[PDB]
Amino acid sequence: MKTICLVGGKLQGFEAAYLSKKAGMKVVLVDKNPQALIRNYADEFYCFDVIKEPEKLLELSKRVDAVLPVNENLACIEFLNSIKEKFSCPVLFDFEAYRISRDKKKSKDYFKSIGVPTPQDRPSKPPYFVKPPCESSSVGARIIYGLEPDTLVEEYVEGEVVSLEVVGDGSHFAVVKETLVHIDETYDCHMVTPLPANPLFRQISHDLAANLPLKGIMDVEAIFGPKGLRVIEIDARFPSQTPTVVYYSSGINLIELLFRAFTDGVEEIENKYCIYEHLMFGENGVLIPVGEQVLSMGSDYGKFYEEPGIEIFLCKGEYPVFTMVFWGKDREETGAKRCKGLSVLKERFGAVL
Numbered sequence: 403m404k405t406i407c408l409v410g411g412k413l414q415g416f417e418a419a420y421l422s423k424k425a426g427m428k429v430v431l432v433d434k435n436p437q438a439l440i441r442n443y444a445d446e447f448y449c450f451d452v453i454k455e456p457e458k459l460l461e462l463s464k465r466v467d468a469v470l471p472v473n474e475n476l477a478c479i480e481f482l483n484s485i486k487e488k489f490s491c492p493v494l495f496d497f498e499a500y501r502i503s504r505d506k507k508k509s510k511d512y513f514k515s516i517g518v519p520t521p522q523d524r525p526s527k528p529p530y531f532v533k534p535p536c537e538s539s540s541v542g543a544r545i546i547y548g549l550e551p552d553t554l555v556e557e558y559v560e561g562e563v564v565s566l567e568v569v570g571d572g573s574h575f576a577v578v579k580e581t582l583v584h585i586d587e588t589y590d591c592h593m594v595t596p597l598p599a600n601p602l603f604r605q606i607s608h609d610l611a612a613n614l615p616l617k618g619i620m621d622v623e624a625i626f627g628p629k630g631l632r633v634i635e636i637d638a639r640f641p642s643q644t645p646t647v648v649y650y651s652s653g654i655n656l657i658e659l660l661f662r663a664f665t666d667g668v669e670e671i672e673n674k675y676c677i678y679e680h681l682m683f684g685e686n687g688v689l690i691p692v693g694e695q696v697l698s699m700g701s702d703y704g705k706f707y708e709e710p711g712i713e714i715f716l717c718k719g720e721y722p723v724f725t726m727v728f729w730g731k732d733r734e735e736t737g738a739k740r741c742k743g744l745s746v747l748k749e750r751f752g753a754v755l
């Protein structure tokens with residue numbers, strides 16, 4: 403049995419912990435927040451700030467098999483970079499790739515440098531899509547029909563938002579499984595489903611990783627627009643939501659693949675269906691779809707229910723949020739599991755949907 407140390411206990415942390423458990427790994431969480439979201443989900447919890455007490459993390463590195471940064475605190479990421487040679491286990495991260503990926507303008511420059519289509523900057527005709535240069539979870543992302551002079555202003559590209567994860571070992575780049583990102587009125591993601599292979603998107607994703615070169619994990623987000631595929635962002639860190647759908651639909655565990663990239667290396671290149679979604683239990687049991695932004699305001703997050711083809715996680719807080727995971731051999735069976743999972747909420751908690 404191996405042990406993984408996660409630095410950060412919110413949504414990235416949950417995803418990493420979930421897949422680590424599927425891999426039969428013990429999960430050690432480090433987080434500066436005594437109320438860290440997944441503190442009770444991890445097998446062990448150590449509450450400290452790694453910047454203030456690096457010696458504690460370095461000591462932990464002696465008794466775990468890998469350390470995985472799962473936060474987007476730049477101060478933390480840059481500090482870990484400065485001490486990474488001191489760890490007694492691999493640090494599963496690509497710091498240079500993250501530096502490019504975190505800055506959306508820098509990323510777009512990179513896309514252009516290798517001939518990858520991306521939305522036109524500063525269009526003359528509405529609607530415009532605007533977003534901060536360095537946020538995630540769709541924070542500050544809005545459609546416009548005096549922003550910071552550093553705000554990204556783009557043409558609005560209509561169509562499917564599609565995600566691909568790539569794990570690189572520096573030499574080989576394993577492009578995994580296409581997923582559909584279902585957006586809400588805030589452009590946050592409330593649902594994820596798998597998609598058939600897209601050879602063009604796979605090649606683009608491969609080339610984005612290969613030209614770095616990627617040693618770590620990165621996802622690629624593209625919109626399948628009316629005039630073709632346009633890559634909107636890359637994020638060189640462990641993502642939330644999509645890796646669960648990747649796991650059920652393809653059989654590939656992204657935590658195991660990432661761990662392999664830093665130990666044995668990786669090789670390039672199941673077909674089930676999966677529905678992943680968040681639902682808030684509102685006033686009087688009204689079920690409301692919500693995005694990640696809502697889930698990250700929670701106070702406690704862990705497993706609520708399981709049966710064959712159904713996993714339900716409960717995020718406690720101001721109005722409970724359920725994360726529902728359904729899988730089966732095809733859309734029909736998975737839809738049947740979704741109904742059963744919903745009816746559990748209906749009969750148990752008097753939920754309405």
Ligand SMILES: Nc1ncnc2c1ncn2[C@@H]1O[C@H](COP(=O)(O)OP(=O)(O)OP(=O)(O)O)[C@@H](O)[C@H]1O
Pocket residue numbers: 409410411412432433434435438439450451452453472473474475478698
């Ligand atoms: N230096 C650090 N040491 C320990 N844990 C950290 C550190 N920096 C961030 N974290 C933890 O990682 C988790 C995710 O952090 P991140 O900054 O990516 O999301 P956030 O929602 O902006 O965090 P916060 O809850 O602080 O606003 C948080 O629970 C945070 O407490």
Ligand SMILES: Nc1ncnc2c1ncn2[C@@H]1O[C@H](COP(=O)(O)OP(=O)(O)O)[C@@H](O)[C@H]1O
Pocket residue numbers: 521531533537538539540541543556557558559560563583585589590623625634635
């Ligand atoms: N140019 C664009 N046109 C239309 N929608 C966009 C555009 N850029 C981003 N979006 C939408 O906003 C969401 C968040 O933007 P993204 O660039 O993927 O940032 P993040 O770092 O926040 O996840 C996307 O998933 C997509 O739904």
Ligand SMILES: NCCC[C@@H](N)C(=O)OP(=O)(O)O
Pocket residue numbers: 537538539540565566583591621622623635637641642643644694
């Ligand atoms: N692989 C798509 C996962 C999307 C999302 N949950 C995420 O973690 O990244 P952002 O686009 O920065 O919000």
Ligand SMILES: [Mg+2]
Pocket residue numbers: 537538539635636637
């Ligand atoms: Mg992003």
Ligand SMILES: [Mg+2]
Pocket residue numbers: 539540623635
């Ligand atoms: Mg994004």
